[PDB]
Amino acid sequence: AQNPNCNIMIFHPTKEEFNDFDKYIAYMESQGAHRAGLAKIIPPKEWKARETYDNISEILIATPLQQVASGRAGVFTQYHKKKKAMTVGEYRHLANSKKYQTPPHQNFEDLERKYWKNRIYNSPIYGADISGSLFDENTKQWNLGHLGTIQDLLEKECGVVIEGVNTPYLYFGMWKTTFAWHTEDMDLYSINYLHLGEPKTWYVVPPEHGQRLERLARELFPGSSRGCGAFLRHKVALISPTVLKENGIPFNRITQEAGEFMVTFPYGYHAGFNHGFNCAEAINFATPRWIDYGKMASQCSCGEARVTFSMDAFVRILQPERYDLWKRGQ
Numbered sequence: 472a473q474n475p476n477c478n479i480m481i482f483h484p485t486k487e488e489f490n491d492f493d494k495y496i497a498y499m500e501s502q503g504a505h506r507a508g509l510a511k512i513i514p515p516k517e518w519k520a521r522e523t524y525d526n527i528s529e530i531l532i533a534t535p536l537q538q539v540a541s542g543r544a545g546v547f548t549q550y551h552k553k554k555k556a557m558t559v560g561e562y563r564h565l566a567n568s569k570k571y572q573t574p575p576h577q578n579f580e581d582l583e584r585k586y587w588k589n590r591i592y593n594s595p596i597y598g599a600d601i602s603g604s605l606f607d608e609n610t611k612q613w614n615l616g617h618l619g620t621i622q623d624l625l626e627k628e629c630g631v632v633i634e635g636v637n638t639p640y641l642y643f644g645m646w647k648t649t650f651a652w653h654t655e656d657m658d659l660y661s662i663n664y665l666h667l668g669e670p671k672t673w674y675v676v677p678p679e680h681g682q683r684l685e686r687l688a689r690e691l692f693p694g695s696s697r698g699c700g701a702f703l704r705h706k707v708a709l710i711s712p713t714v715l716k717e718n719g720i721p722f723n724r725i726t727q728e729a730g731e732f733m734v735t736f737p738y739g740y741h742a743g744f745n746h747g748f749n750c751a752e753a754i755n756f757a758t759p760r761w762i763d764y765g766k767m768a769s770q771c772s773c774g775e776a777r778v779t780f781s782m783d784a785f786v787r788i789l790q791p792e793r794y795d796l797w798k799r800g801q
């Protein structure tokens with residue numbers, strides 16, 4: 472068995488290896504990358520996403536979200552308060568203001584300590600799930616707007632055409648912007664490219680140990696747990712590395728910098744935070760190995776979880792039993 476300790480693997484493909492996305496995902500899995508729940512991919516020195524980021528200031532963040540926390544420093548939930556629209560240029564200026572800017576720090580470990588010590592006492596603002604792409608349409612390799620779709624994969628594996636599309640999303644973050652513990656919709660893969668700016672620190676639980684995190688969350692958020700039987704689907708809960716360690720939860724951490732890809736694997740729980748102003752692009756994707764995970768994915772019927780219409784067909788085909796109740800919760 473490859474990678475039995477479930478370490479996060481880092482890959483440095485050559486330009487030749489970078490020419491077939493599916494093939495390289497499969498290669499990474501042959502080396503056991505998926506066991507960690509997350510892998511980093513450093514693109515060939517020859518590669519670029521686009522020529523320059525000098526012309527991105529006029530993108531609109533229609534609904535910036537302020538992330539307001541409740542609880543304790545290492546165990547907290549966050550809710551999203553809507554703010555007035557701003558452009559990326561205005562958002563960048565806000566992120567670099569005295570109120571929101573990254574504080575002085577010695578290194579990534581120092582900033583991480585500051586994050587978990589003080590996150591709950593500030594309410595950073597970000598732009599999330601903005602449909603669009605910053606890849607140059609002429610970038611031919613690992614262009615997140617030119618991947619094959621999950622709908623075509625499901626048709627290819629299962630024989631059935633379904634409605635739906637699958638397009639990338641942009642994220643604009645600042646210091647302390649927080650990604651709560653979650654897996655992807657339908658326990659899909661995700662690929663995330665950090666286009667520009669300051670780093671992101673990621674935490675991940677190996678997929679074989681996802682249920683341990685779920686059990687701890689039920690203990691730490693007891694009211695939420697009584698509310699939805701899959702409340703981590705709400706994407707509001709945070710648990711620090713110290714608390715994970717105290718509770719024997721296996722996990723790993725890694726910092727992603729501008730110019731690097733991260734892939735999250737089916738049922739790999741992950742959470743993280745931004746170090747300062749940045750822009751990332753992400754999209755979900757599927758391989759044949761995903762199908763069995765999609766069949767088994769937990770669903771929220773709280774009503775609280777966000778659902779795009781594209782997910783309807785995946786539940787409909789892969790989880791016909793659960794479809795009725797999940798539909799109602801939508």
Ligand SMILES: Cc1nn2c(nc(O)c3cccnc32)c1C#N
Pocket residue numbers: 642650661663671672673674741742743744745751752753
């Ligand atoms: C832990 C983590 N997950 N995650 C992150 N950042 C994104 O931009 C993102 C986009 C889609 C889905 N998950 C995302 C982080 C960080 N840091």
Ligand SMILES: [Fe+3]
Pocket residue numbers: 653654655661735741
């Ligand atoms: Fe994610």
